[PDB]
């Protein structure tokens with residue numbers, strides 16, 4: 001149960017380093033001891049401290065389950081969280097190598113990381129503040145606007161394809177072993193000036209990823225690698241803010257072992273034992289705020305039943321445009337969505353908010369709040385989206401299958417609400433409420449494939465009775481509708497024989513269009529009940545035609561109906577849309 005103290009301002013590196021009286025000055029000292037830590041051991045940084053040009057790497061060690069390694073703060077809360085700032089320095093730089101093709105991507109190279117956790121299990125990092133700033137780079141999200149001239153705003157970017165990859169925090173498994181019980185709590189990562197382009201290097205706010213311990217060159221490497229898997233388990237990332245980072249905000253689970261997970265795409269189903277063995281289990285991503293990532297907000301990759309809840313994404317895809325994403329090379333990737341999964345099995349995304357995913361007008365080929373990408377059994381529920389530049393939800397191409405999307409609310413998402421380009425079968429879209437403004441419509445123009453629409457409230461938030469295109473394409477049977485409400489439309493889907501039609505949204509819900517237009521300044525999520533309840537406009541009014549109008553639903557993907565958008569138990573015959581009448 002040893003416990004180190006690092007100050008700076010009060011510290012001195014000649015000191016013993018143990019006890020509050022005798023703190024170390026720098027993190028150089030922590031790094032010399034870092035590999036020997038230490039179940040029950042800790043390293044407390046002093047609130048107020050500023051470790052400029054420093055970093056904290058921890059390689060090849062662990063806690064046990066009775067006593068994890070800490071790394072946290074000490075002293076007066078009110079002095080502000082201790083800063084670790086690596087400023088890209090030589091010491092923070094390491095050679096990253098997946099040791100395998102991981103698709104059309106940089107898989108290998110130099111990386112600056114401020115807080116590196118390489119095969120460290122039973123560790124918990126908390127109450128820190130992490131930067132990886134470059135003074136040459138500055139384009140803050142708080143004052144970002146699109147201008148006719150690049151870097152007009154007193155701003156400046158490094159648009160080089162070969163820009164050094166930078167991370168705030170990286171967790172790396174590359175021993176052929178599990179890395180487990182890693183917890184990140186109440187961190188404030190920002191100004192990680194990474195590579196604008198690279199998706200699968202440790203490049204952005206937080207990134208967890210796994211490598212083969214060696215290149216797969218023979219019969220005998222391939223027997224071993226099949227059994228000995230760098231993977232994650234019980235990774236928890238909560239109460240943190242990531243802000244002004246390139247590329248990814250928060251990404252977890254990309255792995256060289258996709259060479260076995262993706263060997264046979266088949267019909268897009270994903271075997272339970274495959275994803276359990278080669279993928280990351282018990283990943284949880286809770287109560288985070290992500291703002292002004294260059295690319296995607298939060299993304300789970302190759303994860304087995306992860307839980308993504310109470311997070312707020314906001315104004316991401318900042319550099320996915322034609323004036324910033326100028327060197328895509330043969331890698332491409334001028335696309336980003338909000339909060340979503342890649343080749344996961346039955347991920348649950350619930351009670352999230354996603355706002356203002358940017359730049360679909362300016363070269364972001366996606367720009368959606370939610371994206372059930374390739375993967376199987378994705379569940380998006382009780383989420384709110386506002387103001388995304390391209391759709392609320394995409395279901396992406398052949399191997400995006402068995403999606404459920406329910407009890408979500410979409411408000412002023414632009415250029416289509418649902419984006420269904422060549423997606424696989426098994427998708428179910430029910431009890432959602434969508435407010436569709438003149439800048440949008442129900443489906444994206446490029447939509448062409450499967451979804452079953454039931455119990456939804458579609459709201460034409462324009463000043464005429466709109467004649468909507470309810471159907472595009474027929475790939476995998478295209479779009480079928482049953483038991484939905486259409487508000488203020490001239491037409492309905494020809495496939496719906498249980499249509500409920502309403503003339504005027506004011507007799508259907510208390511105040512449609514009135515949910516927030518912005519994240520809370522703190523980045524915490526909006527209240528749904530009590531004095532600050534931000535969603536009461538989407539409640540059905542007395543005599544609403546949405547009361548007891550929905551069919552009992554049978555979820556295509558075996559997820560039992562539990563509650564509504566506001567935590568209320570769904571009774572017998574459900575109400576239409578996302579919110580039951582009280």
Ligand code: NA
Pocket residue numbers: 133134135136137138139191193
């Ligand atoms: Na900067």
